[PDB]
Amino acid sequence: DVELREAQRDYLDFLDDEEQGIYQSKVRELISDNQYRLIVNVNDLRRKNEKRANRLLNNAFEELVAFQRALKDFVASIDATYAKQYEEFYVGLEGSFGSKHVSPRTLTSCFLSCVVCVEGIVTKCSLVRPKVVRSVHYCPATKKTIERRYSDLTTLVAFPSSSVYPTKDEENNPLETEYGLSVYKDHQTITIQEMPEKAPAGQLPRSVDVILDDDLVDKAKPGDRVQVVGTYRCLPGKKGGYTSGTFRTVLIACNVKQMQPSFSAEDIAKIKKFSKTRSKDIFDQLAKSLAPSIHGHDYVKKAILCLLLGGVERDLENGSHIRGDINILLIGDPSVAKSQLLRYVLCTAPRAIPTTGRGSSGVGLTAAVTTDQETGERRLEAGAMVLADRGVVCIDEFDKMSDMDRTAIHEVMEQGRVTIAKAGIHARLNARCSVLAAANPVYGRYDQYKTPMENIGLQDSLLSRFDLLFIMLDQMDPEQDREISDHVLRMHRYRAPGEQDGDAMPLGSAVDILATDDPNTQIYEKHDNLLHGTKKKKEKMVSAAFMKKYIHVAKIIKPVLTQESATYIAEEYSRLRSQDSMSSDTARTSPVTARTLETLIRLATAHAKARMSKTVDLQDAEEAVELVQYAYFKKVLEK
Amino acid sequence: KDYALEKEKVKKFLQEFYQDDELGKKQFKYGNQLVRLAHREQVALYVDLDDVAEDDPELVDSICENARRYAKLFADAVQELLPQYKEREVVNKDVLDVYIEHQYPAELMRRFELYFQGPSSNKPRVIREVRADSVGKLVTVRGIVTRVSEVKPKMVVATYTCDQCGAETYQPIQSPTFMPLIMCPSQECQTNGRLYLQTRGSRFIKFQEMKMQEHSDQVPVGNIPRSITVLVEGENTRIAQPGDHVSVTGIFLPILRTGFRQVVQGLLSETYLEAHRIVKMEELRQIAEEDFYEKLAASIAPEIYGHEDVKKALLLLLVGGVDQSPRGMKIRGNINICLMGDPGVAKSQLLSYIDRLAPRSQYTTGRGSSGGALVLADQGVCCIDEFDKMAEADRTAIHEVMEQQTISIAKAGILTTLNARCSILAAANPAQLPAALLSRFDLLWLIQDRPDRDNDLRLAQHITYVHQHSRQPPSQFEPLDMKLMRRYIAMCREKQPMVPESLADYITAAYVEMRREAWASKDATYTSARTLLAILRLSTALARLRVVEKEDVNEAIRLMEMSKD
Amino acid sequence: WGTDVNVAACKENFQRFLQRFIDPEPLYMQRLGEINVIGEPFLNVNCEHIKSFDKNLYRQLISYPQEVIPTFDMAVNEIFFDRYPLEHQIQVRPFNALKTKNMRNLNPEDIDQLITISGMVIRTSQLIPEMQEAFFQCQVCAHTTRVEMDRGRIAEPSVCGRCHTTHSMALIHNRSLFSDKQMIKLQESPEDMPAGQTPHTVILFAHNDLVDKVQPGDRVNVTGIYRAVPIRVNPRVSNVKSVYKTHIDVIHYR
DNA sequence: GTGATATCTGCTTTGGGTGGGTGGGTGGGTTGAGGCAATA
DNA sequence: AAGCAGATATCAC
Ligand SMILES: Nc1ncnc2c1ncn2[C@@H]1O[C@H](COP(=O)(O)OP(=O)(O)OP(=O)(O)O)[C@@H](O)[C@H]1O
Ligand SMILES: Nc1ncnc2c1ncn2[C@@H]1O[C@H](COP(=O)(O)OP(=O)(O)OP(=O)(O)O)[C@@H](O)[C@H]1O
Ligand SMILES: [Mg+2]
Ligand SMILES: [Mg+2]
Ligand SMILES: [Zn+2]
């Protein structure tokens, strides 16, 4: 009572700060941008009133009610009409919560009625449904209107109000609902699961249930990595006047954050200068910098850079489509770093979905039906390739996938669409992704005296659907062995600067993020003797963060093909296709088709993107032709 | 607000609103319809909110905020105005009127319906943007119809009669469920009977339930399309079918639970859209007069290069040949084509084009669907991609369609036959499909791409231009748009040309010539008696483009021999 | 009842129809003679003939079949017993030669009206017994009573007449009187189907001698009354859904 | 004053996963992935 | 919310 009034007074004092002005300005912006939720940083509250912050974090529901009442009063003070516009104003929290930073494993009963910040992966989402807040009813006979308020266990002030609408007045005269005058709010439920890398040994990850209401709905979709700030509550229930004493617990969100680069003017200037510095060296340097811990497979790295940059998809006025996504296949001998390159792309690309041939199915790749959590409605859940829409799917052990499962990949690889015709569902799903696949030859170890087609053991149509195919061979050469051995041993000797000698990597880890914003760019990575060697360092390495920003900026450019590039590409395609037995030893790894011409155009466009050029010039076309020439032919040894 | 003033204002708008008609230039748009409703030549009245906006935008805003209220207000205004607009007696009185002639709720005598035609200022939404802030408001939503229900009767007013006192009782209904009355409430029965529902004295309305879906191109990245439920009543029924693209104006409302299920369920509710308006979404002679066959064929997928004769064959599959014998007996006209070739020769692009052009069609893949598309493609085209990837069960279905033009199903011994009168356009990669299936195709085209410098140079020049400009390189004759190509195809299909007696000997001479070559070739050609019937089928299709003449037989012959190479 | 049907006038009109109508000896007089010769007490009447002779009688037959057909039965019985002084009295079966409706166009305005539709039989049920007269026996004195069914409801006795005990009358199910009923599923004909739509299906109910008169696979024209029946929310409650289900009470098979 | 007979009160229902898999699938719930035997 | 089982006070004869 008196404590609630004092808390409301304190919160009103906190938001009226013109006498530094951060929250007075924030509320003005809230009004201007047509919002009804203000995000408050608990660090400022802690600075100005420590006791009020501790109470807010430890007695969450009452303190949040007082905070929201104070916010409504303040907004009304700035502008009364706007305050009348909205039923309620909400408060979200951010900053550092100390020990309240938890995961779904560490979120225990001791955090009940507290504000917590949870970090995890979204596994399940639900449909948005309306929830009645205030009901308005009219009496035609008596010409008067009556209002009703509803609340449940999920509201800030929990009370189990009745769901039945009024139907008649105290007088027998009947009542009719004014739906356009009533108030409803959106409601959704999600599940957040522990990050698998953080789980203890042998343990499947734990999960927690979260409730999103109002604006927070649809802020997260399955597959996202999120940070949710909310309040922890138990939902007690009874049946037949009996309670089991065991209660479900939910997190009632007040803020949802994602874990889209943010660009400062200095970074933009750095990117522009980097693009301007060299004409031909940008692409080569970027490709050299891709996966530093792997000794060079230089052409493969250039191809992977092209895949990350991509081409430009064409939409024609008639409605026909030409894809811009570049697909790559790597077939190789054991232990040539195929899986490591796939893992690097998984770690670096903005949207990358891992998959194994033996551990995946067509259903799991495309989409699955099941009963809706509510009403038991036949609903669809996205598979790997739909989750990878406008992203990358990395398929390891591609040769192990079943033929029937493999066939489901053709339509996505070529057209970019998934057709679902099952369980009384007819849908066309967008799966516009780039496929990066790794495989072994039929005999495990490539037989140089057999032909590429006999070693690869795949149908010509599937091979045709791949923009580039790379045969990676392990040839015992003493000089190459020396270089690779030096690189590998240097990698294994490395010790990160923070760690001490003798330290062992733990299996699992506690929560390390202690704030919503990370308390912690340079173009070139700082030289390390072990990571780079004692060589004179003539070749410089671009840093990971700068590479991530630069590739993001370049992916948005759409280079336009020019007449000279088109002429060169056409002539080179004619030469590639006409040439039969161009070298008598030489054999074609994949057939040359009009898809090869489209691949040339795609690679040239990606190269032009790397330079941040608005036009595709002859140098880009030459690079694409060089890549295709390297990839499409292999010498066959004669015994 | 006091609703009496609003009712008076609605009456005013209905009465004195006049709009410049095409000819009259001053007509009362809604007074005439009120006259028609009074005389019962019309059932449904559609109020366009643009007209209301012209006079007073505030009332349009009020209607859009609280639409279900203003629907009742407009209905009451119309019901009160109807007597004043009546001129003569109603010509014909049906069962309800006879019952009436032989207190009543105001809705028992109502025989019209009132709907709103949403304002042009309210731009349409996708099903996602219809959220909790729209509950009880008038919104316009776009989508694809995926399911429709048979029209059924829904009770609006239930009428009872007491067996003892013979009085009449009425029970207006405004819920998905209701509580029937049992015991008579009349004074006579109360001072000292059972109520029984009288179907003849009750008022029903046509009812229909349908599901809508989001357009694929509008779904956000990495999401699944959402769906909404639309409830349709009265004169808005039988408008939407599965597959059509519709724009639905209606009211977004929650579904009312009933019984103990009110108590158990919390504050959450399911929703639906209450439908108010459903909207489905001599130069010409000169184009038909000269070289029109070459022009139309060249217009098939202009972004593809070099498949001139295949494109000509696909045009015949679109017109489809004559369906009747000279005496009116039904015969099979549908033409089946299979494109066999090596990868990357635009087979899938050509099939994708034909699906978009065909008015009724279904595109399927060898493994994208199994164990239905044929039924939806009845009287249409079924594009079967990856034709050699299907299972035996799928193969048997296709075989029976090319034979009987029907699909037979057996639900645990309960047989049923569905119409499958569709054309089959198949694409396959050479390995091994059974010969029993290949001989059924009228045209078997083997697309082989042998490398050649000049042709490869020309193809590359075409493709690079398309990537450079997002359209085909210019040619002497401009391709025709799909909107315009579907008109000529439909117009041609109306004709039913016949083959004369005279050509009998000539067509026979061609058949033996084809047979002799097949025996001499010693290849696996499928020239049989079935080939003779194929000459007639193609010949009549060619005429339907242009009574069959010798020039159509020559083109049909040439197209076929070019196919067998 | 909201019907402009005078029973006596309808009966007189139909007797006049049987007496005077001539097919272009009255036709149905010959039919009655053939009925006597054969012994099957069913008279089929073509609605087109009734329309030609009398347009009011036809209009009333179509609008109120339930009320009007029994008067036709009374008329035919009276006339037949005059001309020829049979297990049961003769029953009229009006029919339309051609279908007057499509299964896809059935509307609420057609409820409780005589209609004809064409279709193909797909399923028939096993026989369903319907109680017509209930049989009660006192569990104390063995006194027996019979109660006539009334609109699907039975008035269970509360006290035995002979011994006045209360709540002692038990219904003896197998001493009651039952009649036959059959459920049939009719599928829309392939010809009338719009292009690319799945066939519609309708439920028909046949009674007494019309049961087992069609088999799955048959193509039939069915003349009957269109009915609308309420659907209970669940078996325990008396709540009903606002949307009614429909079927056809079969009167004539062709 | 006894025999109905009319009014009032408390129980539990629903299909549902906080009501179990130590109730049972002959009491009743689509979709997919995973072992078998027979299969080719 | 809807309906059956049980309890019980109440009119009527
Ligand atoms: N060129 C290389 N540079 C650096 N490390 C390498 C190189 N080749 C192999 N390695 C290391 O050797 C091991 C090779 O295993 P990896 O899974 O990458 O091989 P792979 O080519 O995918 O084999 P497989 O076909 O058997 O799955 C990894 O530790 C990888 O780091
Ligand atoms: N003649 C051509 N003109 C224009 N584009 C062509 C031509 N041939 C092939 N292409 C292009 O090649 C790409 C592959 O074509 P498509 O997928 O239709 O081949 P396909 O014959 O169906 O192959 P598959 O047998 O492998 O399924 C498409 O972009 C198509 O536009
Ligand atoms: Mg590997
Ligand atoms: Mg294809
Ligand atoms: Zn007795």
mmCIF file of C-alpha atoms in Angstrom, chain A residues 126-132 138 143 150-152 161-165 176-182 184-188 214-215 217-218 221 312 314-323 351 367 374-375 377 379-382 386-387 389-390 404 407-408 410-411 415 417 419-421 424-430 432 459-461 464-465 560-563 566-567 569-571 573-575 577-578 580 591-595 597-598 601-602, chain B residues 1-3 65-69 72 128 130-133 135-137 146-147 211 213 215-227 251-254 256-257 259 261-271 301-303 342-345 348-349 352-353 356 362-365 367-373 376 385-386 389 429 448-461 463-472 482:
data_model
loop_
_atom_site.group_PDB
_atom_site.id
_atom_site.type_symbol
_atom_site.label_atom_id
_atom_site.label_comp_id
_atom_site.label_asym_id
_atom_site.label_seq_id
_atom_site.Cartn_x
_atom_site.Cartn_y
_atom_site.Cartn_z
ATOM 1 C CA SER A 126 2.752 -20.916 -31.695
ATOM 2 C CA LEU A 127 0.074 -19.064 -33.596
ATOM 3 C CA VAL A 128 -0.877 -15.567 -32.480
ATOM 4 C CA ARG A 129 -4.267 -15.437 -30.790
ATOM 5 C CA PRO A 130 -6.289 -12.518 -29.408
ATOM 6 C CA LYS A 131 -6.909 -12.239 -25.677
ATOM 7 C CA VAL A 132 -9.776 -10.173 -24.285
ATOM 8 C CA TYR A 138 -24.825 -2.376 -24.937
ATOM 9 C CA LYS A 143 -29.760 2.284 -23.988
ATOM 10 C CA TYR A 150 -10.607 -9.638 -17.295
ATOM 11 C CA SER A 151 -7.399 -11.022 -15.847
ATOM 12 C CA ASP A 152 -5.791 -14.441 -15.532
ATOM 13 C CA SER A 161 -11.626 -13.989 -13.643
ATOM 14 C CA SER A 162 -14.519 -15.668 -15.426
ATOM 15 C CA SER A 163 -14.408 -16.058 -19.201
ATOM 16 C CA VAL A 164 -18.163 -15.965 -19.745
ATOM 17 C CA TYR A 165 -19.407 -12.727 -21.262
ATOM 18 C CA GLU A 176 -25.135 -7.308 -27.162
ATOM 19 C CA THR A 177 -21.351 -7.088 -27.462
ATOM 20 C CA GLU A 178 -19.596 -4.081 -29.001
ATOM 21 C CA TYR A 179 -16.617 -5.887 -30.510
ATOM 22 C CA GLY A 180 -15.195 -2.745 -32.102
ATOM 23 C CA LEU A 181 -15.246 -0.976 -28.736
ATOM 24 C CA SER A 182 -13.710 -3.827 -26.735
ATOM 25 C CA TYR A 184 -7.913 -7.358 -27.312
ATOM 26 C CA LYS A 185 -4.174 -7.997 -27.159
ATOM 27 C CA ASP A 186 -2.061 -10.431 -29.147
ATOM 28 C CA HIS A 187 -0.790 -13.493 -27.294
ATOM 29 C CA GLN A 188 1.806 -16.092 -28.249
ATOM 30 C CA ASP A 214 1.232 -7.142 -27.287
ATOM 31 C CA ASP A 215 4.124 -5.791 -29.502
ATOM 32 C CA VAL A 217 4.539 -11.120 -30.581
ATOM 33 C CA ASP A 218 6.395 -12.549 -33.600
ATOM 34 C CA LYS A 221 10.899 -17.434 -34.883
ATOM 35 C CA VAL A 312 21.729 -11.756 -58.760
ATOM 36 C CA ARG A 314 16.438 -12.620 -62.284
ATOM 37 C CA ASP A 315 12.683 -12.117 -62.261
ATOM 38 C CA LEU A 316 11.179 -11.703 -65.720
ATOM 39 C CA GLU A 317 8.076 -9.699 -66.566
ATOM 40 C CA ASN A 318 6.439 -12.926 -67.761
ATOM 41 C CA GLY A 319 7.067 -14.437 -64.319
ATOM 42 C CA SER A 320 9.921 -16.802 -65.151
ATOM 43 C CA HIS A 321 12.793 -17.162 -62.703
ATOM 44 C CA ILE A 322 16.570 -17.565 -62.847
ATOM 45 C CA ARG A 323 18.370 -18.276 -59.565
ATOM 46 C CA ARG A 351 22.215 -18.108 -41.848
ATOM 47 C CA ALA A 367 8.876 -29.591 -43.882
ATOM 48 C CA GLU A 374 -4.052 -25.984 -29.408
ATOM 49 C CA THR A 375 -7.090 -27.368 -31.261
ATOM 50 C CA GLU A 377 -4.879 -28.422 -36.140
ATOM 51 C CA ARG A 379 0.099 -27.362 -39.121
ATOM 52 C CA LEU A 380 3.446 -27.142 -40.901
ATOM 53 C CA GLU A 381 6.919 -26.890 -39.380
ATOM 54 C CA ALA A 382 9.869 -25.762 -41.469
ATOM 55 C CA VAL A 386 13.216 -23.730 -45.506
ATOM 56 C CA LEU A 387 14.973 -22.595 -42.328
ATOM 57 C CA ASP A 389 15.847 -19.568 -46.908
ATOM 58 C CA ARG A 390 18.191 -16.836 -48.150
ATOM 59 C CA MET A 404 14.869 -40.987 -52.408
ATOM 60 C CA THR A 407 15.761 -36.610 -55.057
ATOM 61 C CA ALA A 408 13.899 -34.174 -52.791
ATOM 62 C CA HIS A 410 16.620 -31.320 -56.870
ATOM 63 C CA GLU A 411 13.698 -28.894 -56.835
ATOM 64 C CA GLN A 415 14.077 -23.683 -58.599
ATOM 65 C CA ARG A 417 10.799 -23.846 -54.043
ATOM 66 C CA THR A 419 5.931 -28.149 -52.937
ATOM 67 C CA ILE A 420 3.989 -29.645 -50.022
ATOM 68 C CA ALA A 421 0.958 -31.740 -51.026
ATOM 69 C CA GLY A 424 -4.736 -32.008 -46.718
ATOM 70 C CA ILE A 425 -2.167 -29.262 -47.035
ATOM 71 C CA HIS A 426 -1.195 -27.648 -50.352
ATOM 72 C CA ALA A 427 1.632 -25.140 -49.944
ATOM 73 C CA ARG A 428 4.581 -23.668 -51.837
ATOM 74 C CA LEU A 429 7.407 -22.854 -49.427
ATOM 75 C CA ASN A 430 10.340 -20.582 -50.244
ATOM 76 C CA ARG A 432 16.121 -20.059 -51.653
ATOM 77 C CA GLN A 459 23.768 -38.953 -61.984
ATOM 78 C CA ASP A 460 24.509 -36.260 -64.549
ATOM 79 C CA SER A 461 21.408 -34.236 -63.621
ATOM 80 C CA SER A 464 24.513 -30.457 -63.477
ATOM 81 C CA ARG A 465 22.614 -28.821 -60.612
ATOM 82 C CA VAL A 560 24.952 -5.128 -64.113
ATOM 83 C CA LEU A 561 26.400 -7.175 -66.958
ATOM 84 C CA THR A 562 28.086 -5.178 -69.724
ATOM 85 C CA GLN A 563 28.414 -5.850 -73.432
ATOM 86 C CA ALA A 566 28.773 -10.724 -72.265
ATOM 87 C CA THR A 567 30.782 -11.156 -75.470
ATOM 88 C CA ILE A 569 31.445 -15.039 -71.654
ATOM 89 C CA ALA A 570 29.654 -16.183 -74.811
ATOM 90 C CA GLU A 571 32.915 -16.846 -76.648
ATOM 91 C CA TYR A 573 31.201 -20.837 -73.301
ATOM 92 C CA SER A 574 31.411 -21.748 -76.982
ATOM 93 C CA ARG A 575 35.053 -22.761 -76.556
ATOM 94 C CA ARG A 577 31.378 -26.708 -75.021
ATOM 95 C CA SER A 578 32.918 -27.239 -78.489
ATOM 96 C CA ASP A 580 36.026 -32.323 -77.287
ATOM 97 C CA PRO A 591 28.842 -32.092 -68.569
ATOM 98 C CA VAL A 592 28.927 -28.617 -70.087
ATOM 99 C CA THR A 593 25.409 -27.228 -70.426
ATOM 100 C CA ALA A 594 23.583 -23.904 -70.586
ATOM 101 C CA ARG A 595 23.680 -24.177 -66.801
ATOM 102 C CA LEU A 597 26.804 -20.400 -68.977
ATOM 103 C CA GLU A 598 24.519 -19.338 -66.136
ATOM 104 C CA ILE A 601 27.452 -15.273 -65.255
ATOM 105 C CA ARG A 602 26.847 -15.957 -61.554
ATOM 106 C CA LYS B 1 -23.090 7.735 -29.075
ATOM 107 C CA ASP B 2 -26.875 7.832 -29.402
ATOM 108 C CA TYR B 3 -27.745 5.429 -32.197
ATOM 109 C CA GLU B 65 -14.322 0.917 -36.278
ATOM 110 C CA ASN B 66 -17.545 -0.828 -35.155
ATOM 111 C CA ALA B 67 -18.826 -2.477 -38.324
ATOM 112 C CA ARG B 68 -21.113 -5.141 -36.732
ATOM 113 C CA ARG B 69 -23.115 -2.325 -35.044
ATOM 114 C CA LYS B 72 -27.582 -3.632 -37.855
ATOM 115 C CA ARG B 128 -0.640 -11.814 -40.871
ATOM 116 C CA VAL B 130 -5.007 -8.929 -39.293
ATOM 117 C CA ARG B 131 -4.266 -8.792 -35.562
ATOM 118 C CA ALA B 132 -5.992 -8.187 -32.228
ATOM 119 C CA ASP B 133 -6.339 -4.461 -32.912
ATOM 120 C CA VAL B 135 -11.219 -7.289 -33.777
ATOM 121 C CA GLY B 136 -14.683 -6.008 -34.613
ATOM 122 C CA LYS B 137 -13.485 -3.819 -37.496
ATOM 123 C CA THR B 146 -7.993 -23.742 -50.191
ATOM 124 C CA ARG B 147 -11.269 -25.269 -48.990
ATOM 125 C CA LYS B 211 -10.382 -21.429 -45.684
ATOM 126 C CA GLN B 213 -4.251 -18.901 -47.424
ATOM 127 C CA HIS B 215 0.279 -15.871 -51.211
ATOM 128 C CA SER B 216 3.695 -17.523 -51.320
ATOM 129 C CA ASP B 217 5.412 -14.350 -52.546
ATOM 130 C CA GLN B 218 4.144 -12.470 -49.467
ATOM 131 C CA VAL B 219 5.336 -14.855 -46.732
ATOM 132 C CA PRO B 220 8.356 -13.480 -44.815
ATOM 133 C CA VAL B 221 11.763 -15.091 -45.154
ATOM 134 C CA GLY B 222 11.914 -18.541 -43.581
ATOM 135 C CA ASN B 223 8.237 -18.629 -42.569
ATOM 136 C CA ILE B 224 5.160 -20.752 -43.254
ATOM 137 C CA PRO B 225 1.982 -19.251 -44.777
ATOM 138 C CA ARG B 226 -0.893 -18.588 -42.388
ATOM 139 C CA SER B 227 -4.595 -19.202 -42.957
ATOM 140 C CA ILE B 251 -15.420 -8.256 -40.066
ATOM 141 C CA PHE B 252 -12.745 -9.865 -37.892
ATOM 142 C CA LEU B 253 -14.472 -11.520 -34.940
ATOM 143 C CA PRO B 254 -13.778 -14.107 -32.226
ATOM 144 C CA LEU B 256 -17.928 -17.873 -29.237
ATOM 145 C CA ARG B 257 -17.701 -21.055 -27.205
ATOM 146 C CA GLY B 259 -21.696 -24.880 -22.759
ATOM 147 C CA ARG B 261 -16.359 -25.200 -22.805
ATOM 148 C CA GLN B 262 -16.901 -21.494 -21.954
ATOM 149 C CA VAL B 263 -15.756 -22.174 -18.420
ATOM 150 C CA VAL B 264 -12.779 -24.433 -19.193
ATOM 151 C CA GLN B 265 -11.230 -22.178 -21.867
ATOM 152 C CA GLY B 266 -9.593 -18.998 -20.711
ATOM 153 C CA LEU B 267 -9.339 -15.568 -22.274
ATOM 154 C CA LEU B 268 -7.995 -16.873 -25.576
ATOM 155 C CA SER B 269 -10.270 -17.234 -28.587
ATOM 156 C CA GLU B 270 -10.191 -18.484 -32.135
ATOM 157 C CA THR B 271 -11.073 -16.010 -34.866
ATOM 158 C CA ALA B 301 8.403 -18.951 -73.411
ATOM 159 C CA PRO B 302 10.253 -16.342 -75.517
ATOM 160 C CA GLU B 303 13.117 -16.357 -73.000
ATOM 161 C CA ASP B 342 19.604 -34.677 -71.457
ATOM 162 C CA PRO B 343 19.911 -32.211 -68.569
ATOM 163 C CA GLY B 344 19.665 -28.456 -68.941
ATOM 164 C CA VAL B 345 17.697 -28.174 -72.184
ATOM 165 C CA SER B 348 11.377 -27.720 -66.702
ATOM 166 C CA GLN B 349 11.261 -24.133 -67.965
ATOM 167 C CA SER B 352 6.643 -24.216 -65.939
ATOM 168 C CA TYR B 353 5.564 -21.885 -68.736
ATOM 169 C CA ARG B 356 1.251 -20.531 -65.949
ATOM 170 C CA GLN B 362 -1.373 -28.533 -62.133
ATOM 171 C CA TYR B 363 2.416 -28.879 -61.957
ATOM 172 C CA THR B 364 3.838 -31.876 -60.112
ATOM 173 C CA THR B 365 7.223 -33.507 -59.604
ATOM 174 C CA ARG B 367 8.627 -37.188 -55.780
ATOM 175 C CA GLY B 368 7.033 -33.937 -54.588
ATOM 176 C CA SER B 369 3.604 -35.580 -54.391
ATOM 177 C CA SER B 370 2.205 -39.097 -54.581
ATOM 178 C CA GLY B 371 -1.045 -40.880 -53.995
ATOM 179 C CA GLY B 372 -4.688 -36.021 -56.594
ATOM 180 C CA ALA B 373 -3.409 -33.328 -58.931
ATOM 181 C CA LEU B 376 -7.847 -30.737 -60.163
ATOM 182 C CA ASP B 385 8.215 -33.233 -64.252
ATOM 183 C CA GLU B 386 10.855 -35.900 -63.640
ATOM 184 C CA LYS B 389 11.291 -40.789 -61.003
ATOM 185 C CA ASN B 429 15.857 -37.876 -68.577
ATOM 186 C CA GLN B 448 19.421 -33.882 -77.908
ATOM 187 C CA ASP B 449 21.955 -31.007 -77.469
ATOM 188 C CA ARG B 450 25.004 -31.846 -79.594
ATOM 189 C CA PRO B 451 27.708 -29.179 -79.171
ATOM 190 C CA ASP B 452 28.289 -26.987 -82.274
ATOM 191 C CA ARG B 453 30.188 -23.651 -82.152
ATOM 192 C CA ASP B 454 27.859 -21.314 -84.038
ATOM 193 C CA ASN B 455 24.676 -22.553 -82.359
ATOM 194 C CA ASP B 456 26.303 -22.509 -78.918
ATOM 195 C CA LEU B 457 27.449 -18.960 -79.645
ATOM 196 C CA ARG B 458 23.914 -17.925 -80.607
ATOM 197 C CA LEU B 459 22.359 -19.541 -77.533
ATOM 198 C CA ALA B 460 24.884 -17.813 -75.274
ATOM 199 C CA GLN B 461 24.157 -14.439 -76.873
ATOM 200 C CA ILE B 463 20.940 -15.974 -72.537
ATOM 201 C CA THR B 464 23.403 -13.183 -71.737
ATOM 202 C CA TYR B 465 20.944 -10.616 -73.094
ATOM 203 C CA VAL B 466 18.180 -11.997 -70.866
ATOM 204 C CA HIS B 467 20.437 -11.716 -67.819
ATOM 205 C CA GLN B 468 21.480 -8.237 -68.965
ATOM 206 C CA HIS B 469 17.973 -6.838 -69.557
ATOM 207 C CA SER B 470 15.574 -9.321 -67.884
ATOM 208 C CA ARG B 471 13.806 -9.827 -71.225
ATOM 209 C CA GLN B 472 14.443 -11.613 -74.492
ATOM 210 C CA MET B 482 -0.082 -14.139 -71.511
#
